[PDB]
Design a binder for these strands. Structure first.
Length: 193
DNA sequence: CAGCTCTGTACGTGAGCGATGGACAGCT
DNA sequence: AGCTGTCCATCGCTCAGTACAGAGCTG
């Protein structure tokens, strides 16, 4: 990491990119090493987020992590994470951390009230749902969820993690459907006013 | 028995490493 | 021609959640 130790990166955090009146908030699991290094969302050379955002038409050009600060004003997209703490993988986080994260995340969403809270990962929505709605899902599905963030009109939309670690959706192509459906949901909500 | 939870394990792509060797040019 | 060093193509390899079997538990 250009002479920067893994030990130093694990201490770093990644600032949220949140404003009011957003259409979408991308909720990641937590910052990975490269995200902590760069100070930008999804720089992972293999992470599919920026590729899926373009292939779906949520961005009209291929953007990258360096553009994340332009996303609220130009595309109506913000960013946060279920957990603040940096680690190399999603399995380095404890259940307590996730639940402490969900409580902080629900307050952030209740403050900014985006049209749609996007869970970039199934695992984080499984914990979120149980913690915030008291609902333990039997057959948890991707896409639009039946509960709004409490005391808001904010919807919950779930996608497989943009991380390339996930073998069930091996390519950015295998996840674009969900980004397209997200775009469709947004265009519907903007049309409904 | 029949459901639950909780943990352990297995799994596809493609980008980017370091290592290796071939192509090639400079010089004698 | 013979030698030596750089460069670059290419190789093999690592590595960035999810689903599910099955043990242990419990109604």
């Amino acid at each position: 990491f250009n002479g920067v130790s893994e030990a130093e990166l694990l201490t770093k955090t990644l600032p949220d990119i949140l404003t009011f009146n957003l259409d979408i908030v991308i909720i990641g699991i937590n910052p990975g090493l490269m995200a902590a290094y760069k100070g930008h969302h999804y720089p992972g050379p293999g992470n599919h987020f920026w590729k899926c955002l373009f292939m779906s038409g949520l961005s009209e050009v291929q953007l990258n992590h360096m553009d994340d600060h332009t996303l609220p004003g130009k595309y109506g997209i913000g960013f946060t994470n279920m957990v603040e703490r940096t680690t190399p993988g999603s399995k380095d986080l404890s259940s307590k951390e996730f639940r402490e994260g969900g409580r902080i995340l629900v307050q952030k969403l209740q403050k900014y009230q985006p049209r749609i809270a996007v869970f970039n990962g199934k695992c984080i929505y499984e914990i979120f749902s149980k913690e915030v709605f008291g609902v333990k899902v039997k057959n948890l599905e991707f896409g639009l969820q039946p509960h709004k963030i409490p005391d808001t009109e904010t919807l919950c939309y779930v996608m497989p993690s943009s991380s390339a670690r996930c073998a069930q959706f091996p390519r950015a192509q295998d996840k674009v459907h969900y980004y397209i459906k997200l775009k469709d949901l947004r265009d519907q909500l903007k049309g409904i006013e």
